[PDB]
Amino acid sequence: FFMVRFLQPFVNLLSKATYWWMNTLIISAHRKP
Amino acid sequence: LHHNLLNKIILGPIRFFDTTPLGLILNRFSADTNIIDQHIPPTLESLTRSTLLCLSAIGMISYATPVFLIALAPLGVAFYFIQKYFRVASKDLQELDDSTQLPLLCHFSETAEGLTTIRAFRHETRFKQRMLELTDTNNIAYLFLSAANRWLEVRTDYLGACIVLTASIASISGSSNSGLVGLGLLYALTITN
Amino acid sequence: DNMSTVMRLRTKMPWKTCWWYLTSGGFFLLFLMIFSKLLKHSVIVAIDYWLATW
Amino acid sequence: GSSKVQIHHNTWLHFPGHNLRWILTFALLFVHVCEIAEGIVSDSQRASRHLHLFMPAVMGFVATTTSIVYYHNIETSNFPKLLLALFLYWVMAF
Amino acid sequence: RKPRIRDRLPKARFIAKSGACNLAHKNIREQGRFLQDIFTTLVDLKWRHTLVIFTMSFLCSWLLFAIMWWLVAFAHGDIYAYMEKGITEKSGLESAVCVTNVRSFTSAFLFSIEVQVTIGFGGRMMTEECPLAITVLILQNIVGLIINAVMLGCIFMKTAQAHRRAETLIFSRHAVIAVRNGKLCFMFRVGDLRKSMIISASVRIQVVKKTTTPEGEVVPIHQQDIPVDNPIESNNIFLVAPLIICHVIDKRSPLYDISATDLVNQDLEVIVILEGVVETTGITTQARTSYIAEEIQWGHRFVSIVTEEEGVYSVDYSKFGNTVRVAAPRCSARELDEKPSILIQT
Amino acid sequence: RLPKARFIAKSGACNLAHKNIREQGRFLQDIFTTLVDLKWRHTLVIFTMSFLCSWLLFAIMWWLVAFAHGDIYAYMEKGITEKSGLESAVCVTNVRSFTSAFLFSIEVQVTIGFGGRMMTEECPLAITVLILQNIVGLIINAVMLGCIFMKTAQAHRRAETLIFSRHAVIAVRNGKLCFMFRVGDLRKSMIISASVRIQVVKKTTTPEGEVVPIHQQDIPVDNPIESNNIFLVAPLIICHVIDKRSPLYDISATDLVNQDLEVIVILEGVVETTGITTQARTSYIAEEIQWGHRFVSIVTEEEGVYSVDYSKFGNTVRVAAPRCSARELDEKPSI
Amino acid sequence: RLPKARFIAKSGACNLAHKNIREQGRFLQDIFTTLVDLKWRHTLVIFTMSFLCSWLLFAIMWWLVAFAHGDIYAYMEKGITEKSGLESAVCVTNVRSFTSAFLFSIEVQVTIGFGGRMMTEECPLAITVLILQNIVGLIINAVMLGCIFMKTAQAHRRAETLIFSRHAVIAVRNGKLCFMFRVGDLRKSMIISASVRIQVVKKTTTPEGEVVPIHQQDIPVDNPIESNNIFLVAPLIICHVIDKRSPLYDISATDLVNQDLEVIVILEGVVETTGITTQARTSYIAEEIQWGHRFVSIVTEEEGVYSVDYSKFGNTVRVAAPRCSARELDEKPSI
Ligand SMILES: Nc1ncnc2c1ncn2[C@@H]1O[C@H](COP(=O)(O)OP(=O)(O)OP(=O)(O)O)[C@@H](O)[C@H]1O
Ligand SMILES: Nc1ncnc2c1ncn2[C@@H]1O[C@H](COP(=O)(O)OP(=O)(O)OP(=O)(O)O)[C@@H](O)[C@H]1O
Ligand SMILES: Nc1ncnc2c1ncn2[C@@H]1O[C@H](COP(=O)(O)OP(=O)(O)OP(=O)(O)O)[C@@H](O)[C@H]1O
Ligand SMILES: [K+]
């Protein structure tokens, strides 16, 4: 081509913890503080 | 600091002192003396104890088990890099915190300071509209600073877990005597933290 | 303000300053302080080694 | 790496059944651990480090983690052709 | 400048002093990232990454086809035929060992290396029994030549792009405005560091501003050119020593309105885009700089940077942005232009 | 019915016939040029087919060579263990069947060369075949490496991706009629030394009685110094002042509908990322020019940095503009 | 008696000297760039030096490697085979000498592989060094191949050969002065879109104090459409008249004998076959221009076809001329 109930927040909590939101800034806060 | 700081500035001309601001000089006399009396010594003592203990535990676990000497090359080097990363990142974040709280408290200094001048100036309710941004404008930075510290711990935590697996393999590999394996495993668990 | 230097001085400033800080505060730090700290740490390590040996 | 939008503000995780795949894959990894584990126990009992039991499993745990990493990367960076390659890989194990 | 301190975001900076196009596109029709894109990223890597991908690719191919060969020498009942130590190898001749003297995966891997990189130690040759092995050998050699060619192309193209090191064209970090030859003039300094010349050079100066129209339309980011004031009206320039590229404004250009007080609140931004083809490389390069209102130190005049040494001229580059604040009239942009009764408003 | 074909299709690709052109034939240089300019899905096939055909053909020749000297004939009738077979004039040691000869080829050309299959100096035919095989192998290898590299080298560029606006607007500007279209970009590297040109193409006569069915009449893009060059990093509106010297003078909205006309816009420049020249074109027909629909702004003012959008590219708000001629526009400027 | 410093030496090659340039640095990758463009004499030695080095280095990593796994001793103590069977643990079969090791080294990094030195699979370090040697060999081979191709790609372009006559003249054409050099060409292919620019370098004070030290004006050249293009087959004479607008307008008969003038001429363009841009620069200082003698005819119609003669490239003859200045000659009719 050119281009159901299962809802919870444990899964975000289980595999998206304390390391993503600031990940880009923390590695490379050089000259863009 | 006390004998030297006073000694340096007593013998000088009034022109420069009345040309550069007084506030910075007062700060140099007060805040920095507080920091060096109160802050630098305990920080240095704590840092030296922690660094030396981490080095000692790593050294113990490497002596007690020969494979550790090869095994210990990559991980600590990566930790070195990560250390430098935080060694700047949060520094910048602390700077951000250092200023983020300057205006907002002064605003609550203002609205209160205008005890009656803004009481019935018909602009009272619109005042909340702007106020409700500053609070967020500060707590947002607060969470970011907290998050930087958290990220370091998480990275550190996973690094620590890797060391334990290595030591465990080494211990079953070592099997020299119960005393050796016990000391090695316990010190790895100590260095974890 | 001195952004090029600040980038060059992004980190790894402390050693010269801290050396001024420590030396003044401490003469013969290497044995009086440094030596005591190293001795205590090695003593704790030897305590562990003796516990293993026993 | 190879006209560009935000990295993650809006497109956090939009792909078909995003909640489900991770939910299952974790179970597969745990099952693989038990298989190793089972062998890991079994190998001591057997005569000369027979490795049929342990490794087939070790390779599988590593492969499963790797598969998951490719789906996550394929997810952050939209590239739906990639996932087609992974589907063929999931079908050669069954 | 506490207002500017809280206004650090509000700022008319269309292009950053570095040169990039600080902008934001959105709501676009991103069709996807088709496969070939990844290959292009392969070309434009750096040496450490290119070397890593190179070596990793060779080793992955070798190990993979070694695993395949190991399976092959397993299924044909070959490893067992060798493992029978009734003799040194009692019945290992007639059984048609599919690949001669392939004993274990390590040995099969040695064979993979020996057959892909064209070494061929002879001690372990393909035999005349198993067609499956011949099929895998054909596949091995075809994939080997394609991978070899592609990696060679990658390494070569990172070699043939060694002419490009970095664009080095230098502007006066600040502008300058003054009076020269009787009328107001706008200046800027341009210099070069590379030894090689820049052929067919050209410069263009544009004003970016938000405009209004009598009919009613408003063009948010409006661009308008300005003359580059050369002697015979031509945007050519010879660049041996650095010089001063002065776009003096009379009436048509938008400098008639300028008032000295207004510069802090001024909304116009000057952009300079110059370009030319490098003589010894053949690449068309283009360098761009931005002159924001905060950097226009009005009233100054530029310094001289040419001295007679012994027989050959010497030139400095330290004094680029240094200026001597020669006195000049104030806000005469309209006063001096729209000549008063004196016709000498200065 | 069928409208007279646009001298330029909307996407470009001038669709004009070409009849009674004397054939230039063909040349094998052309076959090679077709080879180089392939796409991967066929290169990685023609390449493989060349290799496999090469190996099989030379293996057949090898089999014949090992047949004539009777290599096969000596080998097959073997006694218990081996006394008769090894010492006689075999031409290529240990080739005794096709598959064997095939393996000998695949060991000779691709340069593996194990060693179970050695070749002796007793059969001149064998020496000539070896030389020929090796030369053919080198030539095929060189040309295929050249092709693969040429793709790995010139795949730094992609399909021309330039976007013009859909429509065109006859609007009012500076108290005068005007012509406008939009030219944007989705590419990465800013075009270098770009230029824009506008050509009106319509059938014209000449007072000395001669017609020219598709004229071309360049027409001046407005600019404060009349410079065809144009900087572009955000979508732009390449304007066109209209005057009694410009070829659009005699049109009002009433007469627009059933009018034979066109506008072709061709702009050219060198992309710096690929370092290669390129030009893109569009063409607006009579029915495609929405009168009076002055263009809708795009660039906004975000806090730190400006911002643009692309969903609302061709939004045409409408404003009042005179529904009259251009000559009459200056005939009666009273109100 | 030293010549006052000249901005562009008579043989092109602008002789300026700027210092205090902030040392950008010496980029780690710079050697490679220098390595690409060498005299063929070096790129036929650094090849040999690189290959021979790598070979010897891996050989030493290799003779010793054979010793450590017990290989040297088994062969030496008894007979290789007469007294005893192989130890079977030899790392590489029959690898006898730190001579033999060197010979073996040639097989791995050169892809020849004889066969009398196999690689057994016991010693893992041997397998490690085999992987490493093979990777290094491939990287060195590819880099050298790319270098050799770059220096075979640039065998087409050789050197700018555009010849200006030695010195200028100054004469009268149509009752007005002029200024002439004589550009020309050497090789077969013409230049494309060749362009000419004349700049005068002078020390200009300003009526407002400023004194531009070495300031360069541009002056128009002669052409009936005021366009700087040109198309040369036989040497032309590119005049650039002097007038009230021109800066040379104040030159004089006596003053040119001791004067501050510098008329650089630049010529740009590409070459058709190579398709590469190029430019050429040269000059005319005060000593070099001698008034009143025009250049001499070249093109001569032979019996068969036109002939361009070079025997008198820069030959000069005197002709009538007035000794006044440019403003003097046009000062008054009677003047
Ligand atoms: N000798 C030089 N070497 C390198 N860069 C130079 C040199 N002279 C001028 N520049 C460049 O010109 C720009 C502006 O220079 P300016 O005229 O402001 O001199 P400056 O005040 O010393 O510059 P800066 O404050 O950036 O050092 C700077 O970005 C600088 O990079
Ligand atoms: N946001 C955008 N993303 C991609 N292309 C755009 C965008 N806006 C305009 N264009 C380009 O400009 C041309 C004219 O677009 P216009 O605004 O008329 O949309 P349209 O043609 O009415 O709808 P569509 O673009 O779906 O055909 C289109 O060919 C399109 O390629
Ligand atoms: N046959 C030629 N081929 C190439 N260049 C020539 C030739 N004749 C003269 N020239 C050019 O003339 C210039 C100076 O020539 P040179 O001084 O050697 O001889 P000349 O007769 O003293 O001077 P000129 O030849 O200019 O009158 C050189 O740049 C050279 O390129
Ligand atoms: K090239």
Question: What can you tell me about this protein's structure?
Answer:
This is part of a larger assembly, with four copies of chain A and three copies of chain E. Chain A is mainly α and 33 residues long. In chain A, 33% of the residues lie in helices and 0% in strands. Chain A has two helices and no strands. Chain A is flat. Chain E is of the alpha+beta class. Chain E has two domains: 2-23 and 165-346, no CATH class; 24-164, no CATH class. Chain E contains seven helices and 13 strands. In chain E, the strands form five sheets. A four-stranded antiparallel β-sheet of chain E has the order 6-5-8-9, with no helix packed on it. Chain E has a three-stranded antiparallel β-sheet with strand order 1-4-7, with no helix packed on it. Chain E is elongated. The two termini of chain E are 32 Å apart. The chains are: A mainly alpha (33), E alpha+beta (346). The interface between E and G is large, with 66 and 71 residues.
